């Protein structure tokens, strides 16, 4: 059979040499062109166990995205372990592109095609592919953006639902658009995000149904804002156009069972806690002009309080491996022979 194995994955993309955006530049040196002749092969009468929570593809993507950021997005000052480095800190063009992950000779990527798939255990519809689908390496907290939707229902996934310390990854089946803008213009660090109130509320209702299905139909489901910690995880934080946005998500995550837009206030920050490694980095003040990103919310990261009658869920995230996991969950690498 094909034992799961660690190998040198390589990346493929549609990066262009002439595009100075940072993902394109990184990809031009680090990746090959997207596969011009994809071939998925159904494996007949094969059942295969997956485990999305222990998948070395996740670690390899993690290290690639760290390298992409470290090469591309240089802070003026960085503090790690009580040591300070300073360097030139040019602003850059920043918009993620899809990257595919590919197996070299002697290895294969297996893909689980089961509709229900909870991420662990046997899969009865398995195929082999040369490369994964294209995944945008979006670094964010709380909300998963520009990812892949579930096919017919919301799916929630956790390494262990009974353990309240394990993050719940929610995959939506209908995306909710979110538009975030620092206006051209006042206060250069003031920004905001708009989304449809009825779409968001309907999304919360549908997630709650799935949480009830998992935890008990006698349960009442509550959403509440983050209990606290670093700004990065108390807010919905992301990079838009090279600037770090910290958006107050209180309105998104204050809900119980019993205008037309939600507008989230946001700030652009120069001093951030790094995701790549423990430390802090300081960037230059924002560029001038309209800074705007329109994103599809395709998933969420939640934590449950636990510790009766009611279940409170709060926005989570922070470990970007769960972001990668939210797209890599259906894949594993095996060694042929």
């Amino acid at each position: 059979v094909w034992k799961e194995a660690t190998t040198t994955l390589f990346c493929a993309s549609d990066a262009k040499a002439y595009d100075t955006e940072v993902h394109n530049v990184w990809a031009t040196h680090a990746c090959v062109p997207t596969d011009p002749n994809p071939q998925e092969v159904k494996l007949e009468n094969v059942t295969e166990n997956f485990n999305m929570w222990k998948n070395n593809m996740v670690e390899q993507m993690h290290e690639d995205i760290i390298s992409l950021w470290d090469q591309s997005l240089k802070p003026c000052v960085k503090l790690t372990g009580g040591s300070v480095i300073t360097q030139a800190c040019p602003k850059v063009s920043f918009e993620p592109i899809p990257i595919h992950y590919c197996a070299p000779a002697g290895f294969a990527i297996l893909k689980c095609n089961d509709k229900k798939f909870n991420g662990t255990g046997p899969c009865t519809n398995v195929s082999t592919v040369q490369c994964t689908h294209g995944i945008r390496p979006v670094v964010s907290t709380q909300l998963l953006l520009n990812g892949s939707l579930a096919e017919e229902e919301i799916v929630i996934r956790s390494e262990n639902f009974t353990n309240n310390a394990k993050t719940i990854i929610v995959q939506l089946n209908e995306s909710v658009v979110i538009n975030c803008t620092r206006p051209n213009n006042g206060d250069i660090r003031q920004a905001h995000c708009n989304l449809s109130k009825t779409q968001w509320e309907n999304t919360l209702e549908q997630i709650a149904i799935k949480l009830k299905e998992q935890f008990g139909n006698n349960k009442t489901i509550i959403f509440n804002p983050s209990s606290g910690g670093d700004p990065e995880i108390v807010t919905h934080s992301f990079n838009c156009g090279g600037e770090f946005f910290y958006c107050n998500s209180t309105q998104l995550f204050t809900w119980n069972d019993t205008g037309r837009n939600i507008t989230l206030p946001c700030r652009i920050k120069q001093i951030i806690n790094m995701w790549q490694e423990v430390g802090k980095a300081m960037y230059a003040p924002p560029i001038r002009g309209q800074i705007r990103c329109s994103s599809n919310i395709t998933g969420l990261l939640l934590t449950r309080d636990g510790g009766n009658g009611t279940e409170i869920f709060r926005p989570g995230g922070g470990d970007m491996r769960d972001n990668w996991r939210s797209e890599l969950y259906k894949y594993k690498v095996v060694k042929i022979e």
Binding site: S227, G229, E232, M274, V278, G318, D319
Partner: peptide
């Protein structure tokens, strides 16, 4: 993540701290 300082900060809110990757998260 800096766990001690995370716990230090969250405890002053009546919550334990734990790492979320490289970030401090209160519980």
């Amino acid at each position: 993540x800096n766990l001690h300082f995370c716990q230090l900060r969250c405890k002053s809110l009546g919550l334990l701290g734990r790492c979320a990757x490289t970030f401090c998260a209160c519980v």
